[PDB]
Chains A and B, each alone.
Chain A
Amino acid sequence: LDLMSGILHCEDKDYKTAFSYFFESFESYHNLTTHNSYEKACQVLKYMLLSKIMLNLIDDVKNILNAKYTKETYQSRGIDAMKAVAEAYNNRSLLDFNTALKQYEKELMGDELTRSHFNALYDTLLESNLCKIIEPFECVEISHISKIIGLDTQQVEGKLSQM
Chain B
Amino acid sequence: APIKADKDYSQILKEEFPKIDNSALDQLLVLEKKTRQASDLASSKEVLAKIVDLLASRNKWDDLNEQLTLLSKKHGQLKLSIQYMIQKVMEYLKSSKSLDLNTRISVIETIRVVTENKIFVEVERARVTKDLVEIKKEEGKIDEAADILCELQVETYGSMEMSEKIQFILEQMELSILKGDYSQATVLSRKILKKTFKNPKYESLKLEYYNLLVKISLHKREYLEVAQYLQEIYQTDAIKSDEAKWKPVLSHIVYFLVLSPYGNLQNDLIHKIQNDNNLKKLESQESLVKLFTTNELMRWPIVQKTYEPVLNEDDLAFGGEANKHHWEDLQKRVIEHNLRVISEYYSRITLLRLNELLDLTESQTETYISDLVNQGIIYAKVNRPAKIVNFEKPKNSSQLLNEWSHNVDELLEHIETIGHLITKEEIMHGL
Interface centre among A133, A140, A145 (most CB of B within 10 A): A133
A133 to B386 Cα, complex, angstroms: 18
Which residues 106-137 of A sit at the B interface, judged by CB distance below 8 A?
Answer: 132-137
Q: Are B374 and A133 in contact (CB under 8 A)?
A: yes
Is A102 in contact with chain B by the CB < 8 A criterion?
no
Is B384 in contact with chain A by the CB < 8 A criterion?
yes
**Cβ contact of A141, chosen from B374, B382, B384, B390, cutoff 8 A:** B384
A145 to B390 Cα, complex, angstroms: 18
Closest residue on chain B to residue A131 by CB atoms: B374
Q: Are A132 and B382 in contact (CB under 8 A)?
A: no
A138 to B390 Cα, complex, angstroms: 12
Q: Are A141 and B373 in contact (CB under 8 A)?
A: no
Is A1 in contact with chain B by the CB < 8 A criterion?
no
Is A159 in contact with chain B by the CB < 8 A criterion?
no
Is B385 in contact with chain A by the CB < 8 A criterion?
yes
Is A95 in contact with chain B by the CB < 8 A criterion?
no
Closest residue on chain A to residue B380 by CB atoms: A135
B348-389 near A? 1/0 per residue, CB < 8 Å: 000000000000000000110010011000000111111000
Closest residue on chain A to residue B384 by CB atoms: A144
Q: Are A136 and B384 in contact (CB under 8 A)?
A: yes
Q: Are A137 and B374 in contact (CB under 8 A)?
A: no
Q: Which residues of A contact B386 (CB under 8 A)?
A: 137, 139
Is A148 in contact with chain B by the CB < 8 A criterion?
yes
Which residues 75-117 of A sit at the B interface, judged by CB distance below 8 A?
Answer: none
**Cβ contact of A133, chosen from B370, B381, B385, B390, cutoff 8 A:** B370
Q: Are A140 and B373 in contact (CB under 8 A)?
A: no
* Nearest CB in chain B: distance from A44 CB, A: 26
Give the size category of B's interface with A. Answer: 10 to 19
Closest residue on chain A to residue B381 by CB atoms: A137
Q: Are B385 and A144 in contact (CB under 8 A)?
A: yes
Q: Which residues of B contact A140 (CB under 8 A)?
A: 382-385
* Nearest CB in chain B: distance from A102 CB, A: 23
Interface centre among B374, B383, B384, B390 (most CB of A within 10 A): B384
Q: Are A136 and B383 in contact (CB under 8 A)?
A: yes
A39 to B19 Cα, complex, angstroms: 63
**Cβ contact of A139, chosen from B366, B370, B385, cutoff 8 A:** B385
Q: Which residues of A contact B390 (CB under 8 A)?
A: 137
Q: Which residues of B contact A136 (CB under 8 A)?
A: 381-385
* Nearest CB in chain B: distance from A124 CB, A: 17
Q: Are A139 and B382 in contact (CB under 8 A)?
A: no
Closest residue on chain B to residue A143 by CB atoms: B384
Q: Are B385 and A132 in contact (CB under 8 A)?
A: no
Q: Are B384 and A148 in contact (CB under 8 A)?
A: yes
A139 to B386 Cα, complex, angstroms: 7
Interface centre among B370, B382, B386 (most CB of A within 10 A): B382
A115 to B367 Cα, complex, angstroms: 31
Closest residue on chain B to residue A134 by CB atoms: B382
Which residues 136-168 of B sit at the A interface, judged by CB distance below 8 A?
Answer: none
A141 to B383 Cα, complex, angstroms: 10
A132 to B366 Cα, complex, angstroms: 12
Q: Which residues of B contact A138 (CB under 8 A)?
A: 385
Q: Are A141 and B370 in contact (CB under 8 A)?
A: no
A81 to B381 Cα, complex, angstroms: 34
A138 to B385 Cα, complex, angstroms: 8
* Nearest CB in chain A: distance from B162 CB, A: 29
A140 to B374 Cα, complex, angstroms: 19
* Nearest CB in chain B: distance from A59 CB, A: 16
A60 to B91 Cα, complex, angstroms: 49
Which residues 265-293 of B sit at the A interface, judged by CB distance below 8 A?
Answer: none
Q: Are A133 and B383 in contact (CB under 8 A)?
A: no
* Nearest CB in chain A: distance from B59 CB, A: 44
Q: What would 7 more interface pairs be, CB under 8 Å, given A134-B373, A136-B383, A137-B390?
A: A133-B370, A133-B382, A135-B382, A136-B384, A140-B383, A144-B385, A147-B384
B residues in contact (CB < 8 Å) with A: 366-367, 370, 373-374, 381-386, 390
Give 4 closest A-B pairs by Cβ, nearest first.
Answer: A139-B385, A144-B384, A133-B370, A135-B382
A/B interface sample: 18 pairs, CB < 8 A: A132-B374, A133-B370, A133-B373, A133-B374, A133-B382, A134-B373, A136-B382, A136-B384, A136-B385, A137-B385, A138-B385, A139-B386, A140-B382, A140-B384, A140-B385, A141-B384, A144-B384, A145-B384
